[PDB]
Structures are given as C-alpha cells and as structure tokens.
C-alpha cells in the first residue's frame, strides 16, 4: 500500500512497475489524486487535454479521466501489459482516489526518491487538478 501523496508520477510509476515485475506482492496505491506532475500548469494541462481528446475515441485511444485510473494507465505504459507477465502485474495493482474504506488505517509506505520536495521549483500541478480540469468527478 503506497501513498501517492506528494510523489512524482513517473518515478512512482517506475518504482511500482519494477516491484510488480519483481512479482512477489500486490500493490495498492491510495490518494492517486495527490500525485505530482512537474512542469508548468499550462503545459501539463495542454498535453493532457491533447492526450484526452486525441484519438479516434469512437474506435481509437481511450484515455481515462479519474486520477486513479490515469495513474493506472501511466503504470500500464511502463509494463509489458500485452504479455502474460504484464497482465499479471496489472491484475495485482489497485489504485484509489483517497483511501478506500477497507485499507483505512492500514500501514502505508512512501518512496523516498519519488518525494516531491526534491523538486527544485514550484512549477507543478496535481493529478487531481488535471483530472478535474479534464472533467472527472471523484
């Protein structure tokens, strides 16, 4: 159970993906809305609305909207998810907005190298902000 609050999105995703590929545990990620994406808010919002409205969304790419599902997608992009190994890895991963009631009070962990206070500037936005500006209710 990893707490995604104040964590770099890509670095948390890389850590969790490599742990899942090491393949001895089920990983739960809570407060996915509280993950951090470094860079200017305008640029991050522009790229994320481009990815959301890009594809042949009738029969093309289907980029998610909820922050937890977006984080799941980000981890999916760092996995061999078309393979049996990556399919098992994604099946062993659950991501939550906030803390689910069953995991409430459980002991969490944090990735020290994914911490947002190692960033050198204030040019960042939260995944929850990205999702709610793309129109996700959570």
């Amino acid at each position: 159970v990893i707490d995604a609050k104040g964590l770099i999105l890509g670095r948390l995703a890389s850590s969790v993906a490599k742990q899942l590929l090491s393949g001895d545990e089920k990983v739960y990620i809570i407060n996915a809305e509280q993950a951090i994406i470094s860079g200017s808010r305008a640029a991050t919002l522009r790229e994320y609305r481009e990815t959301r409205e890009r594809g042949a969304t009738e029969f093309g790419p289907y980029f998610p909207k909820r922050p937890d599902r977006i984080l799941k997608r980000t981890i999916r992009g760092m996995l061999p998810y078309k393979r049996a190994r990556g399919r098992d890895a994604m099946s062993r991963l659950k991501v939550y907005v906030g803390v689910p009631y069953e995991l409430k009070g459980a002991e969490t962990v944090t990735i020290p190298d994914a911490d947002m206070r190692l960033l050198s500037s204030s040019r960042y936005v939260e995944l929850g902000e990205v999702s709610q500006k793309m129109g996700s209710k959570f």
Binding site: E58, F59, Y96, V97, G98, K137, F138
Partner: protein, 337 residues
C-alpha cells in the same frame, strides 16, 4: 475544389441509435428541490391526441387573450403505489444503493413483475436507515414506485411497471420523513404535479423496425438522372479513399424508433378525474375510452398510444409561474370521422 457545404444529415447526439434496453424510460438526472417535500416524477399511459379551445394566457405572446386551438395529448394516470424507499451512499466511485425498505402490504398483481417481498422487516429497516442517515452513510433517498395498469382498459397489461423517482426536499432528514409518510401509499397525479405547470416527458418512441438511411437520417435521394440508375434511396458514398474505413458518422440503415426520448417544457393544461370529459364519441381508436383520472399535456409527447409515459418536474424550464389554463372547450368529436 470549391465545395458547397451542408449541415450533417441527422444528429449524432443519439448514437448509437439502438433499441432501448427496456420499455420504460429511466431518468438519469433529478432536478433541484425547491419547496415542500413531494415526488419529482409520475407515470401514466398515453391514450391519444385531441384539441382544446383556450384563452391564450401566455404572457408577452401576440395572441395572448384571444381564442386559440391547442392540440393536447391525453395521458391516463391512475394512482401509483409507493412500493419502497431506497437509500443511496455517495463515495468517490459514485452512488451505491445502501438500503431498501419495501412496504408491508403490496398489490397482489405485483407478482406478474416480481416475487412479492414479504411483510418482514419494515420498522427495523426504517430505523436502520435512520441510523445510517444519522451516522452519515446516506447521501440521498429515492422512492421506488410502480403503476397499476389493471384499472385501465385500453392498456391490456396487468403487470405493473416499476421505476425509481426522486424526492424533492430541502434536507435529507426531510426527505426521509416524507418518504416514510408516503411509503406504501397510493399517490395520485395531483400529489405530484399541479395544473398549468411545465414538465418533461420521457418515452419510448414509435418503433419503425429496420429503416433505410433516407428515412432514418433524412439523407437526400438521388436526383434527376441518378434517380433511376439503381441507387435511389441509397447513400451516395460510404467514405473517402483514406481513411480506409466507414465512419460511424455515415448515415446507414438500422433500428429506427423505439428509443428513449425526453421532451422538455410540456405544459399541463388540465388534471381531470372523469374520462368522459375527454373521451370522444366512438372512443379512442384502438384504445377505447378513458375511465380513471387523466392529464392533458399541451402539444405532442413521444411514444404511441398505450406506451408508458414518464412525467417529471422540469429540469430546464425557462418561464416562471405560468398559471392555470382556461380551457374553454374540449373536443370530444369522433376521432374516426
């Protein structure tokens, strides 16, 4: 090439245009509570159309104050039974049903739809819901209701139709109290809607089966010399060379009608109790005569005769308090003439 532009044939706002998964319309949104507690929806059965002569009371209209002939839809609306109270909990993943209490005594013909819930836990179920509301696990409350079409004669069916309706109240406790008051009772359409008010009508439209793109989307026919070269009622092109596929936006044949549709701002012109006031000589064609209480809806409504029509309080109404219509003449002449 300098092209002539046209608006696209039909609307892509109703795609996929498939058959509705049920014969009952389901409401996806409920309006704001703006007064005393009451049900936000009712359900009747469409009978047919007639017309009335009324004085134009519509403010600011050119014909205001003069005699105007207004087509009306007659909707036979027997009292519905409040069968159950359902509680909904809001979380990050949306609303979930958390509790349900069924009325102790329910109509025996409800077995045509479902095996009848027993007269088991109602007091303790209600106190459980009260505890849930007190502890904050309940986000809102809805009333499960069902119609009793056995009293009608133009509708052949005796199996009731069941549907959820919102409760309009300023607070969740008020909603729960009102639902407890109305639980297991028979609500009349006067206890939901008042005369002269605007409503939204949902219904399954007339089924036309499989229809071509000309009728289904309103595409042009082939014209002139092309009209008799073998593709008359038939789309000119399915797509360009690239992309190498037929878009879903190209008008094509498929199911037409039997869709769910919502019409907005249909005004109630009369809440009647005696169907002899509206039934014409010879009866309504293929329906018969009205016997119970009924409603007159200004204009047209989706669905054919005998279709279940769901009425709800307006969700996008513009005008304020409209008033009571002054119906000077209801036409009962033979519709078969």
């Amino acid at each position: 090439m300098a092209s002539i532009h046209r608006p696209k044939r039909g609307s892509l706002a109703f795609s996929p245009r498939k058959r509705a998964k049920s014969h009952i319309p389901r409401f996806r949104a409920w309006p704001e509570a703006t007064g005393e507690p009451k049900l936000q929806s009712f359900a009747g059965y469409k009978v047919g159309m007639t017309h009335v002569i009324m004085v134009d009371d519509t403010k600011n209209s050119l014909t205001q104050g003069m005699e105007i002939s207004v087509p009306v839809t007659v909707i036979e609306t027997p009292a519905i039974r409040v069968a159950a109270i359902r509680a909904y909990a809001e979380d990050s993943t949306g609303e979930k049903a958390i509790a349900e209490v069924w009325a102790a005594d329910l109509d025996p013909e409800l077995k045509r739809r479902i095996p009848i819930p027993a007269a088991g836990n109602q007091a303790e179920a209600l106190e459980n819901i009260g505890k849930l509301i007190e502890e904050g696990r309940v986000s809102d409350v809805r009333a499960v209701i069902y119609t009793l079409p056995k009293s009608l004669t133009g509708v052949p069916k005796k199996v009731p139709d069941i549907m959820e309706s919102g409760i309009s109240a300023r607070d969740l406790g008020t909603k729960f109290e009102y639902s407890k008051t109305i639980l297991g009772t028979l609500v009349s359409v006067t206890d939901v809607f008042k005369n002269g008010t605007l409503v939204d009508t949902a219904a399954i439209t007339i089924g036309k089966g499989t229809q071509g793109p000309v009728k289904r989307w309103g595409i042009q026919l082939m014209k002139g010399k092309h009209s008799r070269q073998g593709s008359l009622r038939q789309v000119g092109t399915l797509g360009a060379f690239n992309p190498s596929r037929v878009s879903w936006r190209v008008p094509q044949m498929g199911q037409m009608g039997y869709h769910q549709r919502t019409e907005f701002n249909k005004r109630i012109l009369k809440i009647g109790s005696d169907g002899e006031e509206v039934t014409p000589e010879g009866g309504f064609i293929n329906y018969g005569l009205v016997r119970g209480d009924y409603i007159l809806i200004k204009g047209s409504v989706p669905g054919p005769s005998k279709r279940l029509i769901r009425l709800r309080d307006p969700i996008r109404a513009k005008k304020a308090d409209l008033g009571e219509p002054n119906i000077l003449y209801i036409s009962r002449e033979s519709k078969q003439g």
